[PDB]
């Protein structure tokens, strides 16, 4: 029980899903044809990985996942790739014409022609669950499909599953790899439309990831392949609580309680350590102390911002591999003193800590060194508002002149939807300001 359904939307959502499911298979020992020689219960079972894999009578372990895109070329690569035998053809849904980087086409003109079919495939997956926990939705902010169609899907999921929880994994745009000049528009529109339908969203800043790959992995010009492989390690760390079980393993829902103090404030900042190449790790055994310390370096954040200039409302450390409580205690004790970690005065307990004993794994031919221990930190800091500020400024510059707006209006949108989306962003920036203010 406690099953989770994954929904991968648009190019970024699809390609990141491919990276994730390959990593999951390696972690659980599932083969590219779905066989899992380790699994003794055939046809079913209530094991931990069953939260993400269903089983067929023949012993196939099938991702509880839907890939959807408005054009075919990206999902076509899944249909013909190493793990093509892993998915049933109906879990891969493609259109003929994409959103053209236009939220309006994704939410309306094109999306409305495939939404019912997508919601149908999802129902079929939900019907195979005994205790469906919720959804994980992977998408870009900038794409026409990642923004517009993802919004439509989320609104539809609220209608069909009520309060059932929906978590987002979102790619925040960066000029170093951005495919469209209008991505700030699509970003604000999808964030406005989705804010009240999402329980918790993990933002990944492409520029942050881009820089980490360049600096820590020694890749001069990172590609999506480099970025997604790193992203997948963060995703694996967050879901590892659900796919494995350990005496010190703590569930992601217990983290969510600590991470979301108010409905709208549901955007944790992620970090991950160690990020190091085989060459550098050859002569360097990284201790719990070193990787814990790295979580508080501004340059290791998955979104570009400065948490020293903000206040923490929560820190959750998800350790995995060779880690024992004594070492964690000493590590945090050190960090508390040598660092300037400021918590709001309304949060009595700021740290939550768990250990998953499953060691980190890496895909052969990847860029990450294989390490004995790793840590992922999810924190809720007001500093993440800096990312909203930067987006909103790019929006305002273009919108003041109505640049490109005719593309959205021509597709059926009104200007009011723009300024409504922008005003919502203004309130969000203010909300992050007020939670940080000391109590009277």
């Amino acid at each position: 029980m406690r099953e989770c359904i994954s929904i991968h939307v648009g190019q970024a959502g699809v390609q990141i899903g491919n990276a994730c499911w390959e990593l999951y298979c390696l972690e659980h020992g599932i083969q590219p044809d779905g066989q899992m020689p380790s699994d003794k219960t055939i046809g079913g079972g209530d094991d931990s990985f069953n939260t993400f894999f269903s089983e067929t009578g023949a012993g196939k372990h099938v991702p509880r996942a839907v890939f959807v895109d408005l054009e075919p070329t990206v999902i076509d690569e899944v249909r013909t790739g190493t793990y093509r035998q892993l998915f049933h053809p109906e879990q891969l849904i493609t259109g003929k014409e994409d959103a053209a980087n236009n939220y309006a086409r994704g939410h309306y003109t094109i999306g409305k022609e495939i939404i019912d079919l997508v919601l149908d495939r999802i129902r079929k997956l939900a019907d195979q669950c005994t205790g469906l926990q919720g959804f994980l939705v992977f998408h870009s902010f900038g794409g026409g499909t990642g923004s517009g169609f993802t919004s439509l899907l989320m609104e539809r999921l609220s209608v069909d599953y009520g309060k059932k929880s929906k978590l987002e994994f979102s790619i925040y745009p960066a000029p170093q790899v951005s495919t469209a000049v209008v991505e700030p528009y699509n970003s604000i529109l999808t964030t406005h439309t989705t804010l009240e339908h999402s329980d918790c969203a993990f933002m990944v800043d492409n520029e942050a990831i881009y820089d980490i790959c360049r600096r820590n992995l020694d890749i001069e010009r990172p590609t999506y392949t480099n970025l997604n492989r790193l992203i997948s390690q963060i995703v694996s760390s967050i879901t590892a609580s659900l796919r494995f079980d350990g005496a010190l393993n703590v569930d992601l829902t217990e983290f969510q309680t600590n991470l979301v103090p108010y409905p709208r404030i549901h955007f944790p900042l992620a970090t991950y350590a160690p990020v190091i190449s085989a060459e550098k790790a050859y002569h360097e055994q990284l201790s719990v102390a070193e990787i814990t310390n790295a979580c508080f370096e501004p340059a290791n954040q998955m979104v570009k911002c400065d948490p020293r200039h903000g206040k923490y409302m929560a820190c959750c450390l998800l350790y995995r591999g060779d880690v024992v409580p004594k070492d964690v205690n000493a590590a945090i004790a050190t960090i508390k003193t040598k660092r300037s970690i400021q918590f709001v005065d309304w949060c009595p307990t700021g740290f939550k800590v768990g250990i998953n004993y499953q060691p980190p794994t890496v895909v052969p031919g990847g860029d990450l060194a294989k390490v004995q221990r790793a840590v992922c930190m999810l924190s809720n800091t007001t500093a993440i508002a800096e990312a909203w500020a930067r987006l909103d400024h790019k929006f305002d510059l273009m919108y003041a002149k109505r640049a490109f707006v005719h593309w959205y209006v021509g597709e059926g949108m009104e200007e009011g939807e723009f300024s409504e989306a922008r005003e919502d962003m203004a309130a969000l920036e203010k909300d992050y300001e007020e939670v940080g203010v000391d109590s009277v």
Partner: protein, 429 residues
């Protein structure tokens, strides 16, 4: 005579299981419910906690409740797990998410009637039921939210039976979850109005004992829970074994609770000595007695020297002269008489039982009703208002249908309770 026992949630089922494990060993019951004891003293009062099944099989009069199956399997697959009646497992699948509102009003609402059915079936099998005992924590969702819902429903069907709980308070030293002060405060509110006697087992105190006194550098719940089972066995000795006391739960309430709301007890256990060079020394009654009253031995993290005892019950177990125990207990009072209120004459009582706990030649169990317990409620109150000042994490509870007012009147009740303890700390004759 007969007592019906209920354990709810993870913590409640954890310590509830160790309790049955420990007293089953004392009464000579093996994990299959067969009697393999020597003395018959172990069967004199066996019916207090056990039902006699066909074939000289004794089965605990226990009801196991939880909103998730996990701990159900755990108990059922452990030592003494086969001893329990299989009908008396009542669990759900949703879980409570450490959310008091889910345990008390939404998810627990559906399971509650199934529990009342088993409760009702056990009560009718009793010759003369004296009352109920509940094990649960206050920091979670099921034991806290649904445990108190159970208390309220049970009181409405058995309004004149004694209601007694072993309640584990949450501590940031042990637990990570930010909403625990919320769950505990809502629970304390229910406990002051619907229980007759509550043992305050403070995870903050249990941690200090394991870390400071016992020198346990990596304490586990198994360590903490082995302190709880030892204390639970001690405080129930005079129910399960005959001798010199003609006492049940009602008599204990009458003489321990001088004012209805002041029914939260401070427990303690001796001996406590870290491994291991001192684990072989012989304990003298003078040493047992000094340890029992030591503030650092208390099982609620509150300094008894800061307040006054309204009432004290002490129970000694093992081979020892009652003369020594008498003299020692009188020494403590005569030599520190300012820590006992003078408007309740002779307010510290002693019982001695011949059978000692397993592994120990002697032992003492302390039950103190002290004004200093307010420090416990102050601590939880400070954590509560720090959060509630800003309505932080409130949406987890309002999304289950709760109002802010319900929180306001829970904190209000706890603040008054604090006030009441303070007023007898300064009351004089």
């Amino acid at each position: 005579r007969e007592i019906v026992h209920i354990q709810a949630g993870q913590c409640g089922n954890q310590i509830g299981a160790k309790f049955w494990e420990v007293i089953s060993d004392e009464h000579g019951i093996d994990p299959t419910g067969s009697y393999h004891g020597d003395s018959d003293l172990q069967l004199e009062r066996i019916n207090v906690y056990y039902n006699e099944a066909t074939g000289n099989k004794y089965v605990p009069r226990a009801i196991l409740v939880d909103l998730e199956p996990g701990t159900m399997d755990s108990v059922r697959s452990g030592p003494f797990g086969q001893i329990f009646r299989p009908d008396n497992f009542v669990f759900g699948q949703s879980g409570a998410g450490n959310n008091w509102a889910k345990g008390h009003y939404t998810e627990g609402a559906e399971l509650v009637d199934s529990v009342l059915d088993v409760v009702r079936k056990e009560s009718e099998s009793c010759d003369c039921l004296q009352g109920f005992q509940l094990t649960h924590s206050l920091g979670g969702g099921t034991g806290s939210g649904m445990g108190t819902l159970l208390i309220s429903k049970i009181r409405e069907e058995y309004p004149d039976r004694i209601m007694n709980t072993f309640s584990v308070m949450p501590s940031p030293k042990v637990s990570d979850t930010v909403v625990e002060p919320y769950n505990a405060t809502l629970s304390v509110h229910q406990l002051v109005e619907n229980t007759d006697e509550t043992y305050c087992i403070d995870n903050e105190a249990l941690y200090d004992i394991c870390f400071r006194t016992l020198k346990l550098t990596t304490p586990t719940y198994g360590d903490l829970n082995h302190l709880v089972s030892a204390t639970m066995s001690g405080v129930t000795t005079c129910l399960r074994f005959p001798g010199q006391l003609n006492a049940d739960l009602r008599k204990l309430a009458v003489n321990m609770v001088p004012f209805p709301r002041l029914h939260f007890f401070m427990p303690g256990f001796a001996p406590l000595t870290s491994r291991g060079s001192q684990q072989y020394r012989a304990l003298t009654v003078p040493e047992l007695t000094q340890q029992m009253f030591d503030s650092k031995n208390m099982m609620a993290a509150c300094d008894p020297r800061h307040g006054r005892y309204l009432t004290v019950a002490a129970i000694f177990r093992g081979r020892m002269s009652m003369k020594e125990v008498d003299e020692q207990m009188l020494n403590v009072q005569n030599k520190n008489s300012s820590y006992f209120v003078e408007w309740i004459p002779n307010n510290v009582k002693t019982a001695v039982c011949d059978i000692p706990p397993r592994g120990l030649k002697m032992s003492a169990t302390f039950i103190g009703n002290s004004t200093a317990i307010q420090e416990l409620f102050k601590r939880i109150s400070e954590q509560f208002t720090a959060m509630f000042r800003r309505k932080a994490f409130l949406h987890w509870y309002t999304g289950e249908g709760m109002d802010e007012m319900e929180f306001t009147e829970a904190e209000s009740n706890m603040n008054d309770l604090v006030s009441e303890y303070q007023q007898y700390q300064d009351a004089t004759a």
